[PDB]
Design a protein around this ligand. Sequence first.
Ligand code: FAD
Ligand code: URC
Ligand code: FES
Ligand code: FES
Lengths: 98, 1304, 49, 49
Amino acid sequence: EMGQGLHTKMVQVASRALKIPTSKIHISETSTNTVPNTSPTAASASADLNGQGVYEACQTILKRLEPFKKKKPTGPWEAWVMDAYTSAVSLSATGFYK
Amino acid sequence: ADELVFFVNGKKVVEKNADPETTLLVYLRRKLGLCGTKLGCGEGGCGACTVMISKYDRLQNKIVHFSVNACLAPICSLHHVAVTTVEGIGNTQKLHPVQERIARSHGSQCGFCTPGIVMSMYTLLRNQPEPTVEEIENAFQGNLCRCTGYRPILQGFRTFAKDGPSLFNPEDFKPLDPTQEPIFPPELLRLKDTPQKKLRFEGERVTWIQASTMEELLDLKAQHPDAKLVVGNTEIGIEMKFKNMLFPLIVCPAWIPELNSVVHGPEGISFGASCPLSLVESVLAEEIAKLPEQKTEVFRGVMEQLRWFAGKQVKSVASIGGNIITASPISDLNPVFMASGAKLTLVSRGTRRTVRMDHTFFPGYRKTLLRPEEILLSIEIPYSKEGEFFSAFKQASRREDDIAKVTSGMRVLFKPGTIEVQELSLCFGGMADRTISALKTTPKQLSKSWNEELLQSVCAGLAEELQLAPDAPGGMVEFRRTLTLSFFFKFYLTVLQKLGRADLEDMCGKLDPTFASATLLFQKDPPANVQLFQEVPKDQSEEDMVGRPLPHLAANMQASGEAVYCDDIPRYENELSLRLVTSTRAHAKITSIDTSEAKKVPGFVCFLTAEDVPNSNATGLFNDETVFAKDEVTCVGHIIGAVVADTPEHAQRAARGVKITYEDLPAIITIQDAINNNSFYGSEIKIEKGDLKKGFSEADNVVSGELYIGGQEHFYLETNCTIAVPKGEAGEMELFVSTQNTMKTQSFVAKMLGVPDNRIVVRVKRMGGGFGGKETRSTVVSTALALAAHKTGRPVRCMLDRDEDMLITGGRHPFLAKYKVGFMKTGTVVALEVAHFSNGGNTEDLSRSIMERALFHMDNAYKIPNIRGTGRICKTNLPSNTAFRGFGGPQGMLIAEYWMSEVAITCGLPAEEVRRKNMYKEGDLTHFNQKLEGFTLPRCWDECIASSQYLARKREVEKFNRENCWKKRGLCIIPTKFGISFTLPFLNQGGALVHVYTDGSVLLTHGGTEMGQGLHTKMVQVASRALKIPTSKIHISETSTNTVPNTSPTAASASADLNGQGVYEACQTILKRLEPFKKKKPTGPWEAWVMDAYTSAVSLSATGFYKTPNLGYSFETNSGNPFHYFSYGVACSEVEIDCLTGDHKNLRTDIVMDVGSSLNPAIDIGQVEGAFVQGLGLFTMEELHYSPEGSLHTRGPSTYKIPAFGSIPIEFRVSLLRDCPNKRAIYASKAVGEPPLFLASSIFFAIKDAIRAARAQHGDNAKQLFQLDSPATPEKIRNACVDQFTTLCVTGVPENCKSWSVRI
Amino acid sequence: HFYLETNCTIAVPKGEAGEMELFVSTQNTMKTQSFVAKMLGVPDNRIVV
Amino acid sequence: CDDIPRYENELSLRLVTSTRAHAKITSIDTSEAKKVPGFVCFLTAEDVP
Ligand SMILES: Cc1cc2nc3c(=O)[nH]c(=O)nc-3n(C[C@H](O)[C@H](O)[C@H](O)COP(=O)(O)OP(=O)(O)OC[C@H]3O[C@@H](n4cnc5c(N)ncnc54)[C@H](O)[C@@H]3O)c2cc1C
Ligand SMILES: O=c1[nH]c(=O)c2[nH]c(=O)[nH]c2[nH]1
Ligand code: FES
Ligand code: FES
């Protein structure tokens, strides 16, 4: 983030992908020990590239939560997540795009 | 003058405003930033702060070197010396041989004690380049290690000794070149030729005068009698730090030549009062070597006491005068000085007098007959005369660096050519508020002949004269009384022997040869150790390190003091310090809080309480705890609030100015208190199988009884510590924490603040030990600190002092068991009922899970067809007890082995036969209906029984016992079964994240935390195999909630299993991605595949995850598997007890352990040894004492005696079972951390066997199936060896009187 | 460019294994890491930007 | 970046740059720099590991 509102856009993207409010998603920083081998934030293309990456990481999480969603299609986001956690399902994912 | 000038690692320090209250440890760490030197205790008992001092000694005219405790050395005592720290001898770029050998020999696990031990060994080598094995062990009397079990440290350092597949190769150790040590600062040599002048230092509260001449000292003492002398500071430093005493004017006389002199006179040797005992020791040693035995009786008495007096660090600076004038009731020297009538010269301006230490020298508690203006100049220790014999005695909890329970000096003078008593002196410490003489007993024996009548007279006399009040400070009233008589008996026999060697055998009679062993002075044979493990296949790549003894990845850094623990992190310029304020009442309403005095302390910022909590004051694993006390306090140590100040000194002072008013509420302390008040965490837990009525009715015999098992303090050498750094945006905070549980730290901070978890990052690089103590209880510091940071917008730090940590953070659960066992005459057990009670303290925490694991292990290794166990967790007004390595298993299994011991005795059959024939077999179901597959225990048993030559050794033990009346041996072999997996199924999960950078280097992280168990090392070994690249290309830097989320605690021995699988999966994903590049260039190197993947836009980042499958037990239905697999092992231990003192030697232990296919045999053997020695402490040494009002008395290494270097089995053999792959864990390994700990029960039951022999010897009537609670301390051992001495000392507990301590 | 914030680096040495953490005003964490690591002669895995 | 609090042991760096478009460096004299209070070191190419 250099004032172009990239984190703002990625949160907006993630919120649509996950179908939860933006209030429940946070970005703190960019770091080589969380995402390696990154291209510079340049060529106007950072929302294009990182938005797809974010989208894919979100889709993985969704896919992992869908058994818990089916079992409780009304019960809130928080219940799906806790259910996944106590069934020992991973709540961490990478995403990538080229 | 008033500039303080000294050197640190060769660099001159000029301190223009030295404060007398500043310790060297604080100066090194906080002023100079040299954090290799550690705080472990602040009271001189652990040696984590050891450094070397060099100076030009003007009196001896040469450069000298000695070791000190930096925690107790005032910088104002250090003018014109040269300090060397661990940083001063070497670094990872060029390690000193001492650093290299401790690292490479697997002598550094958690690493927190490593610098201190390094500096003890370093100092020894600077003084003696070719030490003996004995001198090496002696170097570490004042160093503690909680992880290693000590064996590898000594084994590595044995390579320096003049008198000297494998885990390490000493042949590869680089040689010592002493010309390459640091120069003695030339400036100090120059300055040696200037007169010393008097220096004056002025601090916030204290003035320090370093006096250069006797005149200045006596003048100052005349004009200001209040001036407090300080020499070594090893008492004053304690009084100041622990008893809140302030002496605003101090005078240090250490430089004054008259106080440092040694004069050989006709009557004896006179020591200046400021002579260190190190100098007394070397002077008396040489005197004893060269003079006739007849003249050195008293010298040898002093030396005997100095053997067991602290360690090298304390004795280097502690003065003979300081010990005398301190006038502790438990002085080890004053009894000897008094018994020998040692001559003290006292002076003041214009007065000189000489006195003989007798009863009148010590009038009252900590007083002498010195006038306030008088100092002690010298003490003459006397030559012994013909017919004059001397003995000194000390019995403590542990032999090395411990405080006397009873200590004594005893002297007799015979009328010449006779066996008639001319003089008799019997003096004791630990029997009164002062050093006392047995003045009513002793004169009656004058003119008597040294014979059985005198023995019986003196014992009757001592028992009447040396009364103790039930409430006597220290408790252990019966034991202490027994010791006075027991010591006299040894003296009696010793004098018989000494008479004998004076050709008067005919007159006094010879010693019955079965009594001779009673009079031997402690000697321990040199150690002999064996480590057996399995070689990896000949085919295995040299780059595949799985199953190889790779040293801990941080070992070199730990040896060099470069490894960073939480408090070693540099402070931000705006960083504040936090001090917790805790309840001094077990149960009370908080009436009011007065912060008026606290606000006056310079740098005070604020006092945080429940009202300052932004969101929720409800915390802890079951949400039943406060962040800060609200309305009532429910234990002594309950956190009420927290002071925030600029510095720790100012936070501590301000905290003392927080005055709290209480109104007491009914307190529930003990397990019994809880049973009577029906106060429990939840309902009864129960496992039951078969038919209990039938079994008992079928049984030939039934035995009932109880067992009490004392709790345990973790004594991680690094206490609890958190730094919280507020980021100023969106509630973001980063915490650096010594914790095994990042997830709960994160959750608890977030909930307290009312922010989402995604705002809070918790980072753990490494812990200086955890052992379960940091699975949950770390959060009580983390939340406090987080709040301070939030409130102030500034980083805030808190590291607990040892006393704080030990009081607040709780321990292993004490257990009370009531059992009833039914068995046949053959020793086969057919029925068992056990009720378990644990003392959980004032929050639930992990108590219920700990009870479940105890119940899951009440079988130990034994098939019992009809069985019923219950557990109940008591809710009390004590600190909340928590996880400790074993987590209820050790307690469960000790009870099992205890009734098992009584089955064997009742049947009159050999215990090993009875254990073996009750042992499970392959395919059996446990009492909880889990099938035992891959049941290796019988193999472990047969190998151990054979390699330890158990049967031949039985014969030697029996023979020893028939030939010795006052020493006995015992021998026992104990098995164990330990279920692997968290009792809560869903905690059996872990995650990893891996990156490959475009240079080919790999950055790995996983949910596990490093606490010295070598978890990161193992995960690197795993990743290296999985990726097929050298370990050198893979790095783990830290554990963090923002790299791997929702991690279970590093606990349940499980972390290598879970994180190993996660790492493996993450690695498999990367390999799947590189496959197409591998295929195109199959020999082209790893770096080329990676760069190719990168330039092909292929992700080089992956998560990995694992969950342990098929787990979930139901108590309702006694079905489902709680465990993934079981660990198995056997230990055979031999002991020799002192029937007169309760001391014992651990002669030999042999362990066979099933660790599957070890991931790392060096680490796994280290875990076996470490775990075993923690169990050794639990069952035989470690004891917590509480006031009747629930206040912990035991708050430091002075009173809490963990195993020392000298505690471990002399002969210590560990074998990892060969050829036992465990399919269902990572690379066929098994978890190792907790299962070995219970095998130290072998020492407990070996002691129990020896005691049984002692009771057969001297008992008469003696109850068979006598009681031995845990821990089996010297007190319990001695009290159980009933004899003519105990019989004359027993009786009391007059009804419900007040006593020092209550069993909780 | 006249970015209102000029170029700025904080580098924090960790004293273990060549590890170093850098706080940087940069659009390019990867090349920052790479260039620091090559200059020091340590692997990328020791350097966090 | 510069709003991050300094560590109590934190140092400051200042680059020394060429005042010529194209030249040989004939010599460097740090003798006046060494006189400045708080001066620690002057890094050059020879310091690169
Ligand atoms: C880890 C540890 C272990 C210990 N173990 C033991 C043990 O096993 N047995 C035992 O007996 N003690 C033990 N001690 C106590 C202590 O080490 C000794 O009492 C030591 O001899 C004190 O000497 P010092 O020079 O450090 O005294 P300081 O603390 O400097 O002074 C102690 C007292 O003596 C006074 N004083 C000192 N010199 C003179 C003088 N010439 N004239 C008048 N007053 C004087 C001081 O004013 C002060 O009141 C231990 C202490 C520690 C920290
Ligand atoms: O089954 C266990 N659960 C835990 O939470 C834990 N913690 C520990 O030290 N050992 C164990 N064992
Ligand atoms: S910290 Fe100094 S001896 Fe423990
Ligand atoms: S390695 Fe010694 S205390 Fe940890």
